[PDB]
Amino acid sequence: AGVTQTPKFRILKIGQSMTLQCTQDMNHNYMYWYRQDPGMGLKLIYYSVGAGITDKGEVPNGYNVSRSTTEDFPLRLELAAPSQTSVYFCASRHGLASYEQYFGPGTRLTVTEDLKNVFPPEVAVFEPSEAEISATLVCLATGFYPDHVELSWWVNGKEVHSGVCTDPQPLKEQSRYALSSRLRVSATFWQNPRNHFRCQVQFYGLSENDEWTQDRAKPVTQIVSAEAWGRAD
Amino acid sequence: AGVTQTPKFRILKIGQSMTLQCTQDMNHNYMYWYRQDPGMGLKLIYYSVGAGITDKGEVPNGYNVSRSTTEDFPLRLELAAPSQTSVYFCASRHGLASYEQYFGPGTRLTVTEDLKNVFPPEVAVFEPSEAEISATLVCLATGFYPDHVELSWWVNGKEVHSGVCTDPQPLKEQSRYALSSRLRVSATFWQNPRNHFRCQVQFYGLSENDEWTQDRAKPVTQIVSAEAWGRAD
Amino acid sequence: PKVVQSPLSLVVHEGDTVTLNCSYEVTNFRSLLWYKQEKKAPTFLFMLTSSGIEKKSGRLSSILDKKELFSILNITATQTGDSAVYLCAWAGGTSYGKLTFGQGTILTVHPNIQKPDPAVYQLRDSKSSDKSVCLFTDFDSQTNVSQSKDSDVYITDKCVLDMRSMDFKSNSAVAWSNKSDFACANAFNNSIIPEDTFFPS
Amino acid sequence: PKVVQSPLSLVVHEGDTVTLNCSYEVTNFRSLLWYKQEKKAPTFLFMLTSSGIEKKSGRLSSILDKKELFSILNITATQTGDSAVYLCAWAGGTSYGKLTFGQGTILTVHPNIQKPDPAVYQLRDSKSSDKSVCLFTDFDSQTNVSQSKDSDVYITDKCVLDMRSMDFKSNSAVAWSNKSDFACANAFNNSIIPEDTFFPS
Numbered sequence: 001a002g003v004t005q006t007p008k009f010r011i012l013k014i015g016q017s018m019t020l021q022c023t024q025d026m027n028h029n030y031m032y033w034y035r036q037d038p039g040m041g042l043k044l045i046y047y048s049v050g051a052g053i054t055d056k057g058e059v060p061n062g063y064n065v066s067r068s069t070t071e072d073f074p075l076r077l078e079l080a081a082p083s084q085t086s087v088y089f090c091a092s093r094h095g096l097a098s099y100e101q102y103f104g105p106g107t108r109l110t111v112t113e114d115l116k117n118v119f120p121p122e123v124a125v126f127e128p129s130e131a132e133i134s135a136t137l138v139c140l141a142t143g144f145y146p147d148h149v150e151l152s153w154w155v156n157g158k159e160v161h162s163g164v165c166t167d168p169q170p171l172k173e174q175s176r177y178a179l180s181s182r183l184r185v186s187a188t189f190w191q192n193p194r195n196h197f198r199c200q201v202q203f204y205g206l207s208e209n210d211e212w213t214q215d216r217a218k219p220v221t222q223i224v225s226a227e228a229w230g231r232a233d
Numbered sequence: 234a235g236v237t238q239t240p241k242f243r244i245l246k247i248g249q250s251m252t253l254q255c256t257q258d259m260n261h262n263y264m265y266w267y268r269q270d271p272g273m274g275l276k277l278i279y280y281s282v283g284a285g286i287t288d289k290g291e292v293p294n295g296y297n298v299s300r301s302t303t304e305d306f307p308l309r310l311e312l313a314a315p316s317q318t319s320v321y322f323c324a325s326r327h328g329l330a331s332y333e334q335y336f337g338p339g340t341r342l343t344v345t346e347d348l349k350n351v352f353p354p355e356v357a358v359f360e361p362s363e364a365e366i367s368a369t370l371v372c373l374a375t376g377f378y379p380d381h382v383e384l385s386w387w388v389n390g391k392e393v394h395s396g397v398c399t400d401p402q403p404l405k406e407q408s409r410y411a412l413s414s415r416l417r418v419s420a421t422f423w424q425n426p427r428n429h430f431r432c433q434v435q436f437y438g439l440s441e442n443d444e445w446t447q448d449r450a451k452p453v454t455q456i457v458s459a460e461a462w463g464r465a466d
Numbered sequence: 467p468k469v470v471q472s473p474l475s476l477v478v479h480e481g482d483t484v485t486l487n488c489s490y491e492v493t494n495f496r497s498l499l500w501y502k503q504e505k506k507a508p509t510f511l512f513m514l515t516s517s518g519i520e521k522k523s524g525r526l527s528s529i530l531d532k533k534e535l536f537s538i539l540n541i542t543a544t545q546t547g548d549s550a551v552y553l554c555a556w557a558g559g560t561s562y563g564k565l566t567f568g569q570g571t572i573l574t575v576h577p578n579i580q581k582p583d584p585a586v587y588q589l590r591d592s593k594s595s596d597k598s599v600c601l602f603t604d605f606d607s608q609t610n611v612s613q614s615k616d617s618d619v620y621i622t623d624k625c626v627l628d629m630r631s632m633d634f635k636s637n638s639a640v641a642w643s644n645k646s647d648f649a650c651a652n653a654f655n656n657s658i659i660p661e662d663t664f665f666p667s
Numbered sequence: 668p669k670v671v672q673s674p675l676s677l678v679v680h681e682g683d684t685v686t687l688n689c690s691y692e693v694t695n696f697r698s699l700l701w702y703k704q705e706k707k708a709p710t711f712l713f714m715l716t717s718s719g720i721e722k723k724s725g726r727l728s729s730i731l732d733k734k735e736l737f738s739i740l741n742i743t744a745t746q747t748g749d750s751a752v753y754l755c756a757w758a759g760g761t762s763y764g765k766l767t768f769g770q771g772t773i774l775t776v777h778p779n780i781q782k783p784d785p786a787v788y789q790l791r792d793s794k795s796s797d798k799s800v801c802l803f804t805d806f807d808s809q810t811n812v813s814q815s816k817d818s819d820v821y822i823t824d825k826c827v828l829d830m831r832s833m834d835f836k837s838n839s840a841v842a843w844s845n846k847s848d849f850a851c852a853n854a855f856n857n858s859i860i861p862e863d864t865f866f867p868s
């Protein structure tokens with residue numbers, strides 16, 4: 001019930017416009033917007049110490065802010081630029097004699113010229129193994145751009161964080177990306193044919209009228225998964 | 234005038250024999266032999282607490298030791314093996330109520346089956362630059378196997394450690410290796426045509442009757458260098 | 467140069483402790499705010515405002531003294547999930563309020579495996595052209611992992627999983643291609659694995 | 668498991684301090700021997716035998732207390748040439764004498780550059796086919812460096828040089844190929860350099 005921003009993931013062509021909204025019902029005076037990326041660190045863009053009044057941070061240009069109400073402090077990108085590909089964080093400082101600053105879940109957006117570079121991931125489940133000493137099976141998402149994906153495992157219809165490990169960073173095939181995950185279960189658990197495994201990745205993508213990708217299809221926002229069953233062997 | 238071993242670098246085919254000699258005039262009772270390599274760390278092979286008496290360390294096999302005199306404590310590889318490619322260190326513990334253990338310069342040896350994999354390095358000096366703001370020139374040794382090389386810079390006939398930086402580890406082209414070095418001097422220093430620069434690498438290699446390499450030549454122990462002169466521009 | 471943190475990068479085995487030093491400008495100034503960020507929005511840890519101080523919350527302690535620039539930031543029993551970047555932030559005038567974030571301290575803590583049985587296996591897809599994947603697992607967390615050899619093949623880096631039930635915490639990495647000439651042994655020769663490994667044949 | 672050292676890997680900016688913790692077995696036992704090894708035979712630093720102890724030599728201090736397993740190993744004003752692996756060794760019975768070496772503490776200390784003017788230049792050979800080499804220099808020591816993109820090209824890692832005269836300590840890395848289609852800008856896009864860089868054209 002703290003700071004909540006939107007959307008989580010975004011893609012777009014250059015010279016294009018976007019609005020990021022941030023909401024807090026926490027009843028806080030001060031709201032911030034931060035920009036992050038691997039090499040440039042975490043830096044402030046815009047900030048507001050109250051409703052109706054804003055002011056500039058370290059990187060005020062490329063961005064614009066209008067705050068009508070205390071609860072919401074959004075920001076807008078008038079013209080998209082490759083420099084603006086990044087992870088933004090809405091913050092809330094309240095505050096009364098308080099410097100504590102709370103952040104929203106964060107948002108990730110990317111800017112690409114052609115927009116035909118966008119591809120949905122290809123999911124596969126690989127079922128091991130010979131030499132099961134005690135069973136760890138892996139899932140591969142391959143050839144996806146942009147980098148926005150949510151990967152996870154569903155066993156018998158339920159998501160499990162139990163034995164799951166996923167790569168913190170995706171591999172580069174040269175755009176484009178490949179991610180790998182894995183889970184490890186008891187030897188007898190995998191050997192039960194009644195047990196079902198699904199490796200699912202949610203790919204965020206275009207919404208409407210891009211149009212699509214080179215040689216048709218579309219890279220819309222979708223879910224692609226892979227299926228495996230218990231092997232009696 | 235401390236622990237001194239020999240040779241520094243060695244190469245050979247498998248199933249072959251080699252002797253490493255270690256000498257100390259420091260008048261020390263205890264002499265050791267250690268084996269090192271990136272992943273296995275530093276471990277003891279053989280040790281002698283006096284002349285005539287030896288004993289086994291962690292990895293006694295593959296090796297043999299005979300100590301006739303207090304000063305020298307050598308070791309022998311009867312049959313070469315790829316497992317024995319490594320950096321060995323002769324140590325001296327003296328000692329009387331003293332655990333201090335001093336080491337020789339270290340020796341590096343490699344074992345390869347075909348032995349035709351041995352290649353001399355190709356040296357080049359690259360002379361920069363446009364945009365000299367203040368001049369840093371680099372030397373490239375390329376396509377050399379085995380990995381035993383000594384690189385250094387000679388300015389006007391004298392070796393200089395002044396502005397020199399060399400790569401701690403060589404690059405892999407797939408055997409085989411490539412190493413890069415560089416030095417940086419004052420802008421006016423390079424622009425003097427009377428100043429001479431030589432990037433020299435000493436390559437340790439075969440001695441006699443290998444014979445040579447595939448398609449002739451030979452990879453004997455030699456010195457290959459590269460030459461540059463001051464540019465008036 | 468308002469804030470500088472040390473060490474820049476820290477890597478410890480599980481447990482023990484870590485002391486993170488933070489240096490700030492003395493004119494003017496306000497509370498130091500400790501945050502821990504891992505692959506997501508920063509999480510508020512400590513607020514040092516005006517305090518003496520001897521202060522602790524949970525397994526951590528924020529105690530700061532003057533000592534014009536310092537913070538203790540101790541830790542106890544470092545756990546595998548504590549790997550993250552730590553930021554002491556900043557506060558000061560004029561034009562309140564604001565935060566100045568340092569480069570952050572990247573902290574990595576390896577898990578303890580007791581009886582390693584490292585090995586490399588081979589696995590196949592469900593319905594496919596019989597494309598396959600090789601898996602390196604059970605080794606010790608210190609062992610490095612090499613990137614793609616010819617770059618036309620794909621290899622991940624060290625990643626650790628866990629099971630609350632069996633208490634087992636196991637590392638792993640995967641390497642794969644579509645090629646039929648692809649073989650695990652032949653594949654990972656790039657970096658030498660301990661002889662404790664396994665090559666079924 | 669006779670000896671274990673922490674931290675496993677440590678990276679600090681120039682100066683400050685480092686405290687290296689060494690743990691050993693208590694039955695039986697003898698002197699702890701501190702050595703510093705960099706790309707060559709280990710160099711003897713400290714002998715802790717039987718001592719109390721409060722002990723220091725030069726810029727380092729070996730002080731140890733019991734505290735069944737500990738050693739302080741402080742440091743002052745870390746310098747660029749102090750990058751190396753540190754081993755506390757071991758001594759004990761039976762069957763004297765012997766040393767048990769731990770995994771060692773890998774220590775890296777970055778130099779301080781004040782006014783960076785990072786940039787990428789292009790240079791040519793003396794007598795050749797006009798093969799060329801690209802050079803990335805003057806940047807800050809924290810910036811990473813990516814390995815070979817297609818592996819058919821060659822890129823080194825961060826390396827720092829110095830001049831006693833001009834006091835200048837400068838980092839650098841090189842990237843090269845024989846191809847005429849090879850271009851510095853096009854070459855190093857693998858990792859993003861700060862905009863402070865230079866692309867002469």
Ligand SMILES: *[C@@H]1O[C@H](CO)[C@@H](O)[C@H](O)[C@H]1NC(C)=O
Pocket residue numbers: 064065
């Ligand atoms: C944002 O844009 C509006 C007009 O689109 C402009 O009046 C305002 O000054 C801009 N914000 C800032 C902080 O300048």
Ligand SMILES: *[C@@H]1O[C@H](CO)[C@@H](O)[C@H](O)[C@H]1NC(C)=O
Pocket residue numbers: 297298
């Ligand atoms: C070394 O070899 C000799 C014979 O070649 C053998 O008698 C001796 O026992 C060997 N050394 C050890 C430590 O066994």
Ligand SMILES: *[C@@H]1O[C@H](CO)[C@@H](O)[C@H](O)[C@H]1NC(C)=O
Pocket residue numbers: 487488489535536537538683684
């Ligand atoms: C932190 O660093 C400062 C100097 O940078 C030093 O004086 C201080 O003692 C350090 N703090 C600790 C706890 O080591």
Ligand SMILES: *[C@@H]1O[C@H](CO)[C@@H](O)[C@H](O)[C@H]1NC(C)=O
Pocket residue numbers: 482483688689690736737738739
């Ligand atoms: C070293 O580690 C031990 C436990 O592993 C701990 O009790 C001791 O306090 C540590 N020493 C220092 C100086 O932190």
Ligand SMILES: [Cl-]
Pocket residue numbers: 131132133134
């Ligand atoms: Cl089995």
Ligand SMILES: [Cl-]
Pocket residue numbers: 149150151152166
């Ligand atoms: Cl994920």
Ligand SMILES: [Cl-]
Pocket residue numbers: 159160161162163
């Ligand atoms: Cl779960």
Ligand SMILES: [Cl-]
Pocket residue numbers: 364365366367
């Ligand atoms: Cl210039």
Ligand SMILES: [Cl-]
Pocket residue numbers: 382383384385399
């Ligand atoms: Cl060298």
Ligand SMILES: [Cl-]
Pocket residue numbers: 392393394395396
């Ligand atoms: Cl010199």
